[PDB]
Design a protein around this ligand. Structure first.
Ligand SMILES: *[C@@H]1O[C@H](CO)[C@@H](O[C@@H]2O[C@H](CO)[C@@H](O[C@@H]3O[C@H](CO[C@H]4O[C@H](CO)[C@@H](O)[C@H](O)[C@@H]4O)[C@@H](O)[C@H](O[C@H]4O[C@H](CO)[C@@H](O)[C@H](O)[C@@H]4O)[C@@H]3O)[C@H](O)[C@H]2NC(C)=O)[C@H](O)[C@H]1NC(C)=O
Ligand SMILES: *[C@@H]1O[C@H](CO)[C@@H](O[C@@H]2O[C@H](CO)[C@@H](O[C@@H]3O[C@H](CO[C@H]4O[C@H](CO)[C@@H](O)[C@H](O)[C@@H]4O)[C@@H](O)[C@H](O[C@H]4O[C@H](CO)[C@@H](O)[C@H](O)[C@@H]4O)[C@@H]3O)[C@H](O)[C@H]2NC(C)=O)[C@H](O)[C@H]1NC(C)=O
Ligand SMILES: *[C@@H]1O[C@H](CO)[C@@H](O[C@@H]2O[C@H](CO)[C@@H](O[C@@H]3O[C@H](CO)[C@@H](O)[C@H](O)[C@@H]3O)[C@H](O)[C@H]2NC(C)=O)[C@H](O)[C@H]1NC(C)=O
Ligand SMILES: *[C@@H]1O[C@H](CO)[C@@H](O[C@@H]2O[C@H](CO)[C@@H](O)[C@H](O)[C@H]2NC(C)=O)[C@H](O)[C@H]1NC(C)=O
Ligand SMILES: *[C@@H]1O[C@H](CO)[C@@H](O[C@@H]2O[C@H](CO)[C@@H](O)[C@H](O)[C@H]2NC(C)=O)[C@H](O)[C@H]1NC(C)=O
Ligand SMILES: *[C@@H]1O[C@H](CO)[C@@H](O[C@@H]2O[C@H](CO)[C@@H](O)[C@H](O)[C@H]2NC(C)=O)[C@H](O)[C@H]1NC(C)=O
Ligand SMILES: *[C@@H]1O[C@H](CO)[C@@H](O[C@@H]2O[C@H](CO)[C@@H](O)[C@H](O)[C@H]2NC(C)=O)[C@H](O)[C@H]1NC(C)=O
Ligand SMILES: *[C@@H]1O[C@H](CO)[C@@H](O[C@@H]2O[C@H](CO)[C@@H](O)[C@H](O)[C@H]2NC(C)=O)[C@H](O)[C@H]1NC(C)=O
Ligand SMILES: *[C@@H]1O[C@H](CO)[C@@H](O[C@@H]2O[C@H](CO)[C@@H](O)[C@H](O)[C@H]2NC(C)=O)[C@H](O)[C@H]1NC(C)=O
Ligand code: NAG
Ligand code: NAG
Ligand code: NAG
Ligand code: CA
Ligand code: CA
Ligand code: NI
Lengths: 5, 776, 6, 5, 495, 71
């Protein structure tokens, strides 16, 4: 979902 | 530069646009909805074409009538409607099963489709009148389908994703079959034709590309390739320098430039997977002269690439094209009907033919075990799980539910008496053999034999064979614990003279069958893996075939015996005198079931009492040995002393079970159900009481969880005038007892509360209800 | 997604 | 708290 | 296109056979290293479930449930011999050969059979056991079926001391010397020892690890054995001069870390440079000025450090910084912001004259790459799912890959651009001019490929650093610039 | 001795000593003499005989009362 590693 | 008459060159001098107007529509199949997109100028307008759809898969249109055609996967039917949403009517009401793609022949007025489960390519008229299997030879998993009906081309294309995937071209009559693309494909999925340039566009779902190529397979180019935009494309249609495709992986409809694959954009998103797509516009269906307008071909007339006539006459399944090559005659030869789970097939008796097109297949069966047929009227009968018997013609027409069989369970066996027009079947749930009348407009049915305690009753009947002349039933039976042995048994067809023919090493006994000409029974024993013979006298018995795995069906016709082994997954033919010449008809066929041979038998070659004397009995006629007949009446009725008319069962006994209420006669020789059984949903019976004078039966239902399943109900023994008597004020535990005062017309019952109990009275046909006693 | 339409 | 199917 | 399913190996004839039952079913034969693939059977075969070999006769036996066929063929090829076929063989699923008899299992019949191996025998098979549910395979456990003496194995190498090979010993059909294989790195001149690639390759970060991959899609050898690290490795860049990788780590919710690890034979544990810093989403190395630039996301700062740690300075404040790239020979530094407005910003390496290069049509510009060989800037936006290119001024903006999926790492080398995708868990490549030759470099990885870099054995642009001369006149920290050396002051106070 | 209808076998187990030893005596081969579906078992320690009742299978093995030596 979210733009994180 | 130049373009076809349907287009006009623009100021650019190399771009062409449609003649004008008609506002091209793009129609997309999503599971619940056929979405229409009206391409108004540059924007889109989305709405549903039709309200009543279950799972749409294929789409195409007819430019001359302005109708949209679609296949529904769950209903197993092909429909059509006008583009504006009116006049929805069915095209094919039976015989499709995972029909993958549709193509309308707007010139020849024909309708082509690919089917995945049948592994065939079929053609029919635009009204679906006449149906035949066009190509079945090397077809494994046909999906995409496209046509070029313009005179001079008359070719069809399809894509197959079997073990050696390919795209094939053939004449639209299926003559000049050839393979055009076989080199760089894994999952060919969806086809479309660029009519002005004579190019065919195809896609692949595994290599993820869109390509176009010419009719001969040579000049192929890639539109979209090595591009992560394609996840799982399924259907493709093009219009005015654009391709539109449906992607099942990403669940959206896409647009791109049809030559270099640029200018990619989403047309619409879908909640479900979008499957079929079609562009509705006159440009998509160019006009041409119809070569078969003046043809005298009977049945189908198919366009062809053959130069002189450009047409060929073809005729439906089960017909021969005559030597005139313009007229077709009925193929009255016999064929083997191979019952399977989920479908019944008609295969030719000739082992060299692997077509399976002797009849229109009966798809959508559930728990298929057995089948029967009536050559007159050409009907096929099979039972359905909920307790119904269905019918359909050999040509796929008039598929209807014929009659309800039993309210107590599902029927297993079948056998049709073709001279008295009765059908006999077994219902192993209620453990009875009963009969049902085919003649007339009103259905009548009688339980013939029931399970009393004796060795002669039915235990668990599997198979039925009927001998119209000489009037005997034969059945195979697994027996029961502490009663009926596992046996081959017989009776008069009125159920009078029960007899045991063979008993012994029968454990996993399969269906029985009869060779009427030779008067010998045949049956299969799974526990020993053999097929045995026996005279109807019960004297001579022998083993015919050895080392079978799990025989399921067998039939004897002419000099050969056909059996299907469910575990070997094979259908084999052997001589009826001995195994000898073993021949395989089909192999690698899963879910094999019973067999039957459809053939000509007439009422003239054999006659009995019920055929000589129509209208002798007012309800049911059952023949008996010696040419005589017995009259009989439906469940709930008893035969009058005149021996011909019917009357209500005046004297019987009532037994109540939790599932149902049933009536049995006092005289033990009568195995018929003396009352129409009270069963079905919402039934949980604790007690029953009777009202002999007024002809009612009172019972009390119970339900711990669901309310409104508690109360007292009444019904007549003939099954009419069902009515709730007591519904309000039932205790936590239901009505625990019922008693009727037949003199004063009072009804006594007990309410059972958690810590209290009432005795109550209710005057029948009256709202007066009183409590007599309250105890703790 | 598996190729079979069913 | 009694008999049912 | 091929799907090899059941594989068998023959150390005597030194061949590798397998069955394929997908599109275009066949039986293939190959060397022990899979380099001389040839087809034995490709006609009249569908769904070969299993195959077996008798070493003493050199025939390959296989079963077809779709043809109800058991057949055999010689290793050298020729015609298929039908051993057994017909209705009574519905679903053979596995086969083996022992002496003069074949043993196979049947799924439908729930039996394990034994019959003569010679074709044209008509004796009915004997049943070893019956009513076994869900049969799949059958194999022989015998010393006679696995000979070990050199005479019985045709003097097979790799029998003694693994043939002297360090990693893998592959024998070849008629050669007396084994072809040694390398699990990681390249085979030396010695011909039996393995060392680091000593060539150019990719490096990427994965959960707990730094991993390596060759540029050639057809070379599957690892340039170096996987480096193991503590916590998730988020970003990395390579230092030529010391032959080490500078990489960042993420611990807990907020505890970021920066470390380095050497690529020499020592391969010691990664040496930590900082701890207790916030989550870091990118890192770049200045090869000219020998300073490290990195982005702290949880703390909204881009900051610089010396390769030894030592002096540290803030370069800029940024809403949501990710990737950084440096151009020391022209004194400029670029980075990406995916904050409330997404934009790509340029400053001097001192952090002065900050300007936005592209600040339209961007939502999640995760990846940044600069190509010195053509003077173009590349970036990958994960929300738009596009990779784009422009001049360093940001004028000639072009898409190079449409639908890039969820891009994160980007790098460029030779003619291709390499990116990591967090949605498909693959590394793809495409032509840097027009995105034509798009292939996937990796299979679907078991976890998200979090960042990517090249490793280069040749020196990049080697312009003269003005900052070495008297520390470029600055009192503490200095960085190159468009005009002259620019000074910075430490973050330990107000300056 | 015990019967395992799930495995179509008759097996033995040792009581003496601190280490348990178990063996399968009869299994389901193709022959009628084998074990089809063992229900009951009765042993005669003297005369070294073992008797069992078999439901048989949809195979060579019929429903029978069978006997064998306890080896
Ligand atoms: C529509 O088209 C179909 C196919 O072309 C026709 O079907 C054939 O019709 C003929 C004529 O009825 C059939 O021939 C008859 O077959 C019977 C069954 O034969 C079995 O064994 C033979 C080998 O010996 C097989 O070829 C065959 O498949 C069967 O397994 C025979 O018993 C008949 O013999 C009788 O007539 C002959 C000839 O006079 C005598 O010599 C015999 O003594 C005996 O009296 C006969 O041979 C043929 O089998 C059908 N083929 C198929 C595929 O079923 C339809 O007739 C046709 N319909 C119309 C009206 O056009
Ligand atoms: C609550 O209300 C229900 C209706 O909702 C009542 O139910 C009716 O009860 C009457 C009782 O008399 C029933 O009438 C009887 O019908 C019998 C069946 O008739 C068929 O067969 C006769 C030949 O035997 C034919 O003539 C006729 O057309 C039918 O084909 C008759 O056999 C009975 O005959 C008796 O009465 C007549 C008239 O007085 C006499 O001539 C006879 O000799 C004989 O004594 C009778 O007619 C009626 O059918 C019921 N209808 C329904 C819907 O079931 C309940 O009675 C009422 N509850 C209580 C407790 O009162
Ligand atoms: C939805 O669209 C369809 C297709 O255009 C409409 O069907 C058409 O309806 C008209 C008017 O009822 C029909 O006209 C009639 O044609 C016959 C000749 O065929 C003529 O004899 C009559 O006097 C009359 O003019 C027309 O035939 C029919 N089209 C077809 C192909 O059958 C339909 O009416 C539209 N629905 C609504 C609600 O308007
Ligand atoms: C697609 O939409 C267009 C309008 O965008 C429809 O064409 C017009 O429909 C209105 C409806 O009231 C008429 O009054 C106009 O005369 C139509 N023509 C033009 C040129 O505006 C068109 O019918 C739609 N297509 C379909 C078949 O639904
Ligand atoms: C269906 O496929 C079979 C198998 O590919 C075809 O048989 C081959 O036909 C070609 C000529 O077209 C011959 O050269 C091959 O030797 C044949 N192979 C075998 C094993 O028979 C067959 O022709 C195809 N039939 C149709 C109607 O398409
Ligand atoms: C997509 O469509 C556009 C028009 O909407 C095309 O536009 C041209 O794009 C090139 C790109 O180098 C420009 O140089 C031209 O000046 C554009 N022409 C016009 C009239 O705008 C574009 O070619 C299409 N996409 C592709 C991949 O070709
Ligand atoms: C089979 O179905 C067809 C309809 O598809 C029946 O034919 C119709 O029968 C009704 C009877 O009242 C006639 O009014 C119609 O004119 C007939 N034609 C059509 C096309 O509807 C036919 O009777 C059915 N056959 C049987 C035996 O059920
Ligand atoms: C991914 O990395 C995490 C840590 O960054 C790994 O977590 C460890 O898992 C093992 C059990 O497999 C535990 O014993 C350790 O204590 C964990 N460490 C921490 C810091 O929590 C994880 O196993 C890795 N997973 C994969 C699939 O690579
Ligand atoms: C996006 O970047 C452009 C880059 O030019 C910005 O445009 C500049 O805006 C400043 C301030 O308004 C002006 O002084 C410059 O003259 C503009 N440059 C040119 C050549 O147009 C633009 O403001 C940026 N947009 C946002 C929202 O920051
Ligand atoms: C009883 O049944 C008959 C026939 O079904 C019906 O016509 C009549 O209306 C019913 N009467 C009552 C009171 O239920
Ligand atoms: C193996 O492959 C090489 C290269 O294609 C070929 O020249 C050779 O003949 C093949 N077989 C042998 C015997 O090495
Ligand atoms: C952010 O910077 C602060 C000082 O301003 C420092 O205390 C902290 O360690 C950094 N990030 C974290 C982990 O909050
Ligand atoms: Ca795909
Ligand atoms: Ca098979
Ligand atoms: Ni059975």
């Amino acid at each position: 979902x979210x733009n994180x590693x | 530069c130049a373009c076809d008459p349907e287009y006009t060159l623009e100021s650019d001098g190399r771009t062409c646009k449609v003649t004008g107007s008609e506002n091209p529509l793009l129609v997309v199949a999503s599971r619940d909805k056929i979405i229409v997109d009206n391409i108004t100028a540059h924007t889109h307008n989305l709405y549903s074409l039709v309200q009543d759809v279950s799972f749409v898969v294929a789409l195409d249109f007819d430019s001359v009538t302005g109708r949209v055609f679609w296949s529904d996967l769950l209903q197993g039917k092909t429909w059509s409607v006008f583009q504006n949403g009116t006049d929805k009517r069915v095209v094919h009401d039976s015989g499709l099963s995972v029909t993958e793609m549709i193509a309308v022949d707007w010139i020849g007025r024909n309708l082509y489709w690919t089917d995945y489960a049948l592994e065939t390519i079929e053609v029919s008229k635009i009204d679906g009148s006449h149906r035949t299997v066009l190509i079945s030879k090397n077809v494994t998993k046909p999906r995409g389908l496209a046509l070029d009906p313009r005179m001079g081309d008359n070719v069809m294309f399809w894509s197959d994703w079997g073990h050696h995937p390919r795209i094939e071209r053939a004449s639209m009559d299926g003559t000049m079959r050839t393979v055009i693309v076989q080199e760089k494909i894994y999952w060919p999925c969806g086809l479309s034709i660029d009519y002005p340039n004579r190019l065919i566009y195809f896609m692949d779902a595994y290599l993820d590309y869109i390509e176009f190529c010419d009719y001969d397979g040579h000049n192929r180019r890639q539109v979209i390739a090595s591009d992560l935009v394609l996840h799982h494309p399924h259907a493709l249609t093009l219009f005015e320098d654009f391709v539109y495709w449906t992607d099942r992986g990403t669940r959206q409809v896409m647009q791109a430039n049809k030559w270099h694959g640029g200018n990619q954009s989403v047309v619409m998103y879908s909640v479900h997977q979008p499957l079929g797509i079609t562009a509705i516009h006159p440009s998509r269906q160019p006009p041409s002269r119809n070569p078969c307008a003046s043809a005298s071909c009977s049945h189908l007339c198919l366009l062809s690439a053959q130069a002189p006539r450009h047409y060929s006459c073809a005729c439906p399944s089960g017909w021969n094209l005559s030597d005139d090559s313009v007229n077709c005659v009925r193929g009255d030869q016999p064929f083997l009907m191979s019952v399977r789970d989920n479908i019944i097939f008609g295969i030719s008796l000739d082992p060299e033919v692997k077509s399976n097109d002797a009849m229109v297949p009966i798809s959508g069966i559930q728990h298929g075990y057995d089948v029967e047929f009536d050559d007159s009227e050409q009907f096929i009968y099979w039972v359905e799980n909920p307790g119904e018997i269905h019918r359909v013609k050999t040509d796929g027409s008039n598929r209807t539910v014929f009659a309800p069989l039993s309210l107590l369970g599902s029927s297993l066996g079948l056998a049709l008496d073709w001279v008295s027009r009765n059908i006999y079947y077994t219902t192993p749930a209620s453990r009875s053999i009963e009969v049902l009348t085919l003649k007339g407009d009103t259905r009548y049915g009688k339980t013939l034999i029931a399970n009393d305690g004796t060795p002669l009753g039915v235990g668990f009947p599997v198979g039925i064979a009927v001998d119209p002349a000489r009037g005997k039933l034969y059945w195979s039976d697994h027996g029961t614990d502490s009663g009926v042995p596992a046996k081959i048994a017989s009776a008069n067809m009125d159920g009078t003279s029960l007899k045991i023919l063979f008993t012994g090493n029968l454990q996993h006994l399969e269906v029985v069958t009869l060779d009427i000409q030779e008067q010998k029974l045949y049956w299969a024993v799974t526990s020993r893996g053999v097929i045995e013979r026996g005279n109807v006298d019960g004297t001579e018995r022998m083993i015919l075939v050895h080392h079978l795995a799990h025989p399921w069906g067998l039939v004897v016709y002419g000099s050969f015996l056909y059996y299907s082994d469910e575990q070997y997954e094979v259908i084999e033919r052997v001589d009826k005198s001995s195994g000898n010449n073993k021949v395989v008809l089909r192999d690698n066929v899963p879910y094999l079931r019973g067999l039957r041979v459809y053939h000509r038998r007439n009422a003239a070659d054999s006659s009995n009492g019920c055929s000589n004397n129509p209208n002798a009995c007012q309800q049911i006629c059952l023949p008996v040995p010696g040419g005589m007949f017995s009259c009989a009446c439906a469940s709930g009725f008893k035969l009058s002393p005149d021996g011909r008319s019917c009357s209500p069962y005046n004297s019987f006994m009532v037994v109540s079970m939790l599932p149902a209420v049933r009536g049995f006669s006092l005289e033990l020789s009568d195995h018929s159900e003396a009352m129409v059984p009270v069963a079905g949903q919402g039934r949980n019976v604790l007690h029953a009481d009777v009202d002999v004078a007024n002809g009612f039966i009172y019972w009390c239902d119970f339900s711990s969880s669901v309310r409104s399943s508690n109360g007292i109900r009444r019904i007549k023994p003939d099954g009419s005038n069902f009515t709730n008597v007591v519904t309000y004020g039932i205790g936590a535990n239901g009505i625990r007892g019922v008693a009727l005062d037949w003199a004063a017309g009072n009804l006594y019952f007990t309410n059972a509360f958690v810590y209290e109990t009432l005795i109550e009275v209710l005057r029948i046909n009256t709202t007066y209800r009183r409590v007599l006693l309250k105890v703790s | 997604x598996x190729l079979x339409x069913x | 708290x009694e008999e049912x199917x | 296109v091929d799907m090899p399913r059941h594989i068998i190996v023959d150390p005597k004839h030194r061949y590798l056979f397998w069955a394929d039952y997908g599109q275009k079913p066949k039986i293939e034969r190959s060397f022990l290293d899979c380099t001389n693939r040839t087809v034995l059977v490709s006609e009249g075969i569908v769904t070969p479930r299993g195959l077996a070999m008798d070493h003493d006769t050199g025939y390959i036996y296989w079963v077809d449930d779709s043809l109800d066929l058991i057949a055999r063929i010689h290793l050298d090829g020729g015609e298929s011999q039908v051993v057994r076929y017909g209705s009574r063989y519905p679903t053979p699923y596995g086969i083996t050969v022992f002496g003069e008899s074949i043993i196979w299992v049947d799924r439908n019949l729930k039996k394990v059979f034994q019959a003569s191996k010679q074709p044209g025998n008509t004796d009915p098979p004997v049943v070893i056991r019956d009513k076994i549910n869900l049969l799949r395979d059958v194999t022989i456990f015998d010393e006679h079926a696995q000979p070990l003496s050199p005479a019985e194995l045709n003097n097979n190498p790799c029998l003694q001391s693994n043939g002297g090979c360090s990693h893998f010993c592959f024998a070849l059909p008629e050669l007396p010397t084994p072809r040694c294989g390398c699990a990681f790195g390249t085979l030396g001149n010695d011909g039996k020892s393995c060392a680091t690639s000593q060539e150019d390759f990719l490096i990427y970060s994965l959960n707990n690890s730094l991993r390596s991959l060759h540029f050639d899609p057809r070379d599957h050898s690892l340039p170096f054995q996987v480096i193991s690290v503590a916590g998730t490795a988020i970003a990395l860049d390579y230092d030529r001069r010391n032959n080490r990788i500078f990489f960042t780590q993420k611990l807990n919710s907020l505890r970021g870390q920066i470390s380095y690890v050497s690529l020499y034979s020592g391969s010691s544990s990664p040496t930590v440079l900082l701890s207790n810093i916030g989550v870091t989403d990118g890192i770049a190395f200045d090869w000219i000025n020998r300073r490290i630039y990195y982005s702290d996301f949880s703390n909204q700062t881009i900051n610089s450090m010396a390769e030894d740690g030592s002096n540290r300075a803030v370069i800029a404040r940024v809403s949501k910084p990710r990737a950084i790239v440096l151009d020391p020979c022209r004194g400029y530094m670029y980075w990406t912001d995916w904050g409330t407005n997404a934009k790509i910003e340029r400053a001097t390496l001192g952090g002065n004259f900050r300007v936005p290069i592209v600040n339209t049509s961007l939502v999640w510009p995760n990846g940044l790459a600069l190509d010195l060989e053509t003077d173009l800037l590349y970036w990958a936006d994960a929300s738009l799912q596009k990779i784009e290119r422009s001049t360093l001024t940001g004028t000639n903006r072009e898409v190079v890959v449409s639908t890039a999926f969820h891009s994160f790492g980007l790098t460029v080398y030779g003619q291709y651009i390499y990116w990591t995708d967090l949605y498909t868990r693959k590394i793809y490549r495409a032509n840097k001019y027009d995105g034509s030759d798009l292939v996937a470099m990796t299979t679907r990885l078991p976890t998200q490929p979090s960042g990517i870099s090249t490793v280069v054995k040749t020196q990049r642009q080697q312009c003269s650093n003005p900052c070495d001369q008297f520390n470029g006149g600055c009192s503490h920290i200095c960085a190159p610039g468009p005009n002259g050396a620019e000074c910075q002051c430490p973050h330990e106070g107000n300056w």
